[PDB]
Amino acid sequence: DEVKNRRPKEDAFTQQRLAAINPVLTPRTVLPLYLLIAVVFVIVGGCILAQNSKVDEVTIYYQDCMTNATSSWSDIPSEHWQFVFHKYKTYNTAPQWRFVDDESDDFTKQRGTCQIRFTTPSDMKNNVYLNYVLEKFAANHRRYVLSFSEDQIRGEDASYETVHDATGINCKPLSKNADGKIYYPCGLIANSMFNDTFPLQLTNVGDTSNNYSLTNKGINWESDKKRYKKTKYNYTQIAPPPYWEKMYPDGYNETNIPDIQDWEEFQNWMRPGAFDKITKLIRINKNDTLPAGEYQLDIGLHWPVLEFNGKKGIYLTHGSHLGGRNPFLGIVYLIGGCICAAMALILLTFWLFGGRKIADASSLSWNMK
Amino acid sequence: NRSDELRTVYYNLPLPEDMLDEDGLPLAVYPRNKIRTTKYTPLTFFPKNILFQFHNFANIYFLILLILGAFQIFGVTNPGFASVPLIVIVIITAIKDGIEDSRRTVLDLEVNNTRTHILSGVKNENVANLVDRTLQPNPECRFAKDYWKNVKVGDIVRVHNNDEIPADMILLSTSDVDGACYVETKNLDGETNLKVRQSLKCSKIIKSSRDITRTKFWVESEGPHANLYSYQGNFKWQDTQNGNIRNEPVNINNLLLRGCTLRNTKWAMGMVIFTGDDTKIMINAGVTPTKKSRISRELNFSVILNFVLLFILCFTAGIVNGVYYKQKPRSRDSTNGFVSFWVAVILYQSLVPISLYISVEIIKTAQAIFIYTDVLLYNAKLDYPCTPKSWNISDDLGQIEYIFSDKTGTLTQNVMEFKKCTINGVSYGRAYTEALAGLRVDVESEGRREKEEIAKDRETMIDELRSMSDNTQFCPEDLTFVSKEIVEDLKGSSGDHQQKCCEHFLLALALCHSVLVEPNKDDPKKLDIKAQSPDESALVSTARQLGYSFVGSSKSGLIVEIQGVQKEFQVLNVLEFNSSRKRMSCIIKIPGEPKALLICKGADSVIYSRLDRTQNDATLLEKTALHLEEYATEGLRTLCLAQRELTWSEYERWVKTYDVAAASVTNREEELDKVTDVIERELILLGGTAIEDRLQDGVPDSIALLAEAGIKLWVLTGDKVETAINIGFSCNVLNNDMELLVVKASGEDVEEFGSDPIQVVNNLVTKYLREKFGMSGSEEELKEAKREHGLPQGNFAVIIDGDALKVALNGEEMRRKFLLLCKNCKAVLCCRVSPAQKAAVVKLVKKTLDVMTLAIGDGSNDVAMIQSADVGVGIAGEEGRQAVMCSDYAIGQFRYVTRLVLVHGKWCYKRLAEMIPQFFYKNVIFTLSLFWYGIYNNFDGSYLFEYTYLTFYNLAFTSVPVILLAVLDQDVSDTVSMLVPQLYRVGILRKEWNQTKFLWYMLDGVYQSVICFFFPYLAYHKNMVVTENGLGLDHRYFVGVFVTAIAVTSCNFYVFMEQYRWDWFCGLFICLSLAVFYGWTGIWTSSSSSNEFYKGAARVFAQPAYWAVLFVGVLFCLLPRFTIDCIRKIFYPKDIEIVREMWLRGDFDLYPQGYDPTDPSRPRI
């Protein structure tokens, strides 16, 4: 003899029934937002401007000291110094500067000492920063940035393979010298180390009795030292970079290994610049307030700058809660607030004077034809 | 394929027992019965999928940059492992497509694992007077278990009632004499009536199940010769009395197709002839194409535009190297130009991030799973929700402008009934329609009142009939009659003439029928009724309910029980309904004084032509005629009844002329037609019956919504033209004042336009386009018809036959003229259309006037246009399971589409239209920043950001908000979108997304990147020491991280602002994305593997200057676009914000989220 569920899930999320708040672009609820944003940000921009014009700074350009100075104190050409002081807006007070030659050194391209005497009509509120600024010196090229090896930072005895045949981050051009001694500082970053001997003190002019001394130690993050350790090489396979021979005619002997841990300035130079203008911290002061008066600084010139038409100078600043002194933030805040207010007012006047009905149920597309 | 070389298969000629080869013929090429409805072959799937994915232009350039990235001799470091994102995206695409194909294959397997049985137990020749009564049948014959997997040419199959057809079939033996079986071709066409199929005349005498295996013969049959209704076979057999071979030819009429089903036959054995692709459904099916989305084409156009941007940028960026490279300054230590360009292009490698296609497929899969899980589309009547089969197509729905439907299961179910009748100009029965909407806004209250009145009338009709007497088989499941006056006019309160007329009308309603009465196999008490036609079954059920039950088919007469008393009539002759006659008649005899009675049911035109107009009272006929005309112009389909009385001599000479003319041989058709004409020229009409077909739930309102939303729809019909016409009038599609521009090729018009159909249709189209409306012309007309994108105008209707449409579609001039005519019209109906014809016309309408269409339908015939419409949707359920094989989507019933396509389509069409600008903004903001930074360092090719950023940013930081905006966006509420579907006009006019919009966002991104770079750079430029402590900065990576944080927060805020639905979900992910950005930066810099930074968190997030620059960047990223949008809102107010404001004001407040079409009782005021 012959003989011949699947209910879907019902949840709030499954049916897309979540608590929603549809935004509304009606003027009566968005104009207050415009007004409050405009006023709050224009007043904070004004506060930024006020906190920005409260710091003084001085820049002195001495990249051409030998060709323009004499053995006596001479006035600084106008294109080599720029002052900002909130106390005095017309404080020109052209300082003086001179150069003295040293015959003990044979590097005729860059040798000697440049002395700058300058006046200060204000005081530095227990915070002094002396920096070296550079221009027309490209320090961000692709191979230049990578021209170093992180393995040497830990102090391990890297081999030629580990420094030249490594991954994309290695010192390619200056891995090895002519004889075959591996560089402990390898690459262009360490080879382009600067040769401007900055003093550890300030030579006062008015009060030569108690003239103040600076301190370049501790100018980097304390925790960051935990990554940089002492060299652990065999004091025989290490040679200085070819541009470092002036500091070591023989090289590294048994008692001259440069401890990276306490060398903050070299580590600071290991942070290559990004733009055409480059400056790093080299002198810091937080012990005592710097008083007003005349001050003299002596700088040793061994690092060539003019051979590539570059420029160098010194930059002294008290510092501020907004870093260096710059009015650009105040300008953009002010212009943003002003343009927001102007746009709000102009949209209001079109909406009122030349404005139609707020909403019509018969103005839609199908309602003409 | 195979056309000639007919296959000769033996039967009842056993092979020798000592050696067998399990066949009677040598080996030949054998198409397998397995039906492959999937996309790609599982064995050969990878190359097809890759080549389909290879057709884009972004993945190929990713592949070449990974390949050429290593071919450069010491130019860039060897990738080694920097190639896995391409691998993972291609394998995840392959896995998704493989899961889709796995679902298709498991569906095919569960279809093909049905049940079939073939007899065995005795020695078979293949696999283990005329009639004599000497051999006793062997009791070993039992039905075995068989599957559709192993059926092939050379096999016999036994099929019973309520079973489908395994393949193309030849009728051998049926349950009755003469071998006549009844089949529905519903999957092939939407005909209502059963289809008659006669078996072989040689096997019309065998009765017992063993007598089918008592004669020896052989079969000569040809293969599929690529035809639809043509077949030639030869059955040859040897006689036992004399030695000779006698043959019989077999035409198409004996051939049974595949996509059919057997009704009203207990058992039938047949011979398998065609297997596999030989079936007509496989011929008309197609190849189930890739079904590739439209938006991806212009997405690839945008991608190649970005490639051109990269090429033009690096063609002027790399040229600066040479004016400084060969010049001063230098204190560091052609082919060089080419390597500089190469390093620049590998630097700017993220203008088009790889995440594009993976994000697109993730969004599409999320949309598909949400569509699947949507409970508002669940069809609880048969436990099947809306299932998206192909998940690649979930974005094309927004541009749906044209709708193509069928009659098999789309517009209506397979049920009809009786509602109204005219007896002597008196109406009986009442229904509910919307025909009073416009004869002179409040129509819902009247509709509800009428529905309540109909319900009350039906209830009281049922009550009166159960109370006045106890009918034997009275059940309310088929009582569709409403009018109660029938009882008191039968009681005798309606005079004598009207009483007799209504009594005879009711009697004739229960006599003219081709139905056979059979007892129910479940309960003998309540016998079931199985008719040769659905309208006949409905009429028989109504007659059973009204107390004139028809039981039994005696040798001379039929049993009729009136109210309980049973009597047998005396039927004399029956003339069956003919497709060309449009009339079916019966001749019976009543013993008094005996008298012959003729009653014929037919079409209105034929009934009115066959009448006695030469003498009459000029009142009854005129009132009946006016009732007929009013029903026709309301849109009712009806039949008419004509009787006549004959004396003894009249009956005698009628039967004499019948026996001498129609009972003859040699083409008795003309003689029978002449006899019927001469006997029915004189007739007396007695009234008319009206058949009514029930459509799907919510068809008229759905059609109205689609029409008012700008989506002008079409309906393509099958069986007959009058069926489609009355269906259209019943629905709210065809209006009475609407002009019917009927287009027929072989109608009665020919007597004044006789020529070939080409010239006939040319003259018709010229007289249409010159007289009523002047737009004659082709090229200029097409140019003007390109630029409308949908508008309902013209208020006319066109009806076209299959031959007319094919002769207008063959030629290109005819095609464009028909396209112009159909664009001018709004009610295009196509009838007698073959699957190939409708596929060709849908291809033409898709190509010319490029518009994205839909082919909703049901059956095995509509696939031809389904696979053409580029969006696949079909009616699933117990009624149709064959179109859903190829359809992209498969609905429970048509009532879902009218919401789905009207809501989700638009939704996604906007969601993606917003996601694409966000995705091509989030990469420009990252890449043009590097480009701008390059101007310092002079395009040397130095990274500004961390090496891990270029691979981790687009994958973790700014990816989540864009994806969430694309997926969980809600432009408007579903209820409000359904209430006002005019919003769909934006998808109709495609103004939302285009090249101008792309250029606007590209300029905005360029401006954004300009700001995002120039702000921190100008903040630094004075001193390089803006950090509140000096102590060391200036490194390229720190300015890079500042600008990347600015860019990512700007992108997140911009996505949040552009999002139309601010919920606790998208905002939560935006906040967590910002938090994870900060946390990952901190945790990466506070680790041993932080080689360069080692201090990023302390260097970045401890500095008020960083917060100030972030805030000012937020200002300058938000204000410009915000104010432009605010200005545009007043300048060119898009309808979206106006409807949103109206919604929020409270207009649509009392309306609940759960919209229901069956609730017109909303208290508006």
Ligand SMILES: *[C@@H]1O[C@H](CO)[C@@H](O[C@@H]2O[C@H](CO)[C@@H](O[C@H]3O[C@H](CO)[C@@H](O)[C@H](O)[C@@H]3O)[C@H](O)[C@H]2NC(C)=O)[C@H](O)[C@H]1NC(C)=O
């Ligand atoms: C290698 O060992 C060296 C001996 O310790 C030393 O290099 C330099 O050796 C000279 C030889 O006496 C020292 O003296 C020089 O400087 C003094 C002034 O301090 C002069 O009076 C001497 O005449 C002579 O010019 C140097 O002081 C010494 N260099 C340093 C930096 O101390 C180093 O220890 C080793 N080499 C290096 C490069 O450090």
Ligand SMILES: CC(C)CCC[C@@H](C)[C@H]1CC[C@H]2[C@@H]3CC=C4C[C@@H](O)CC[C@]4(C)[C@H]3CC[C@]12C
């Ligand atoms: C002496 C002059 C001619 C050159 C030196 C001045 C430098 C600092 C200025 C002057 C002209 C400037 C260029 C003007 C045009 C362009 C093209 C632009 O798409 C990238 C920036 C770039 C390349 C500028 C770079 C800086 C530039 C070269």
Ligand SMILES: CC(C)CCC[C@@H](C)[C@H]1CC[C@H]2[C@@H]3CC=C4C[C@@H](O)CC[C@]4(C)[C@H]3CC[C@]12C
């Ligand atoms: C070199 C010249 C010819 C290039 C064309 C520049 C001018 C004509 C185009 C480029 C950008 C355009 C502006 C883009 C944005 C807006 C803001 C809108 O609210 C008013 C129109 C306005 C102000 C357009 C005015 C015309 C415009 C300034």
Ligand SMILES: CC(=O)N[C@@H]1[C@@H](O)[C@H](O)[C@@H](CO)O[C@H]1O
């Ligand atoms: C933090 C600290 O105490 N540093 C001192 C330093 O001031 C001193 O000059 C030096 C003498 O060798 O010894 C160090 O330990």
Ligand SMILES: *[C@@H]1O[C@H](CO)[C@@H](O)[C@H](O)[C@H]1NC(C)=O
């Ligand atoms: C150096 O500068 C001084 C001061 O202006 C000037 O007089 C002198 O000519 C300069 N020397 C040059 C240009 O060689």
Ligand SMILES: *[C@@H]1O[C@H](CO)[C@@H](O)[C@H](O)[C@H]1NC(C)=O
């Ligand atoms: C202070 O000035 C005197 C001038 O004779 C100089 O010798 C001394 O070195 C100066 N102080 C310091 C700390 O150098």
Ligand SMILES: *[C@@H]1O[C@H](CO)[C@@H](O)[C@H](O)[C@H]1NC(C)=O
């Ligand atoms: C003064 O400066 C020295 C420089 O080494 C430092 O060690 C000391 O702590 C400072 N004194 C105070 C009170 O800060």
Ligand code: ALF
């Ligand atoms: F159902 Al058809 F042509 F057969 F529309």
Ligand SMILES: [Mg+2]
């Ligand atoms: Mg219908």
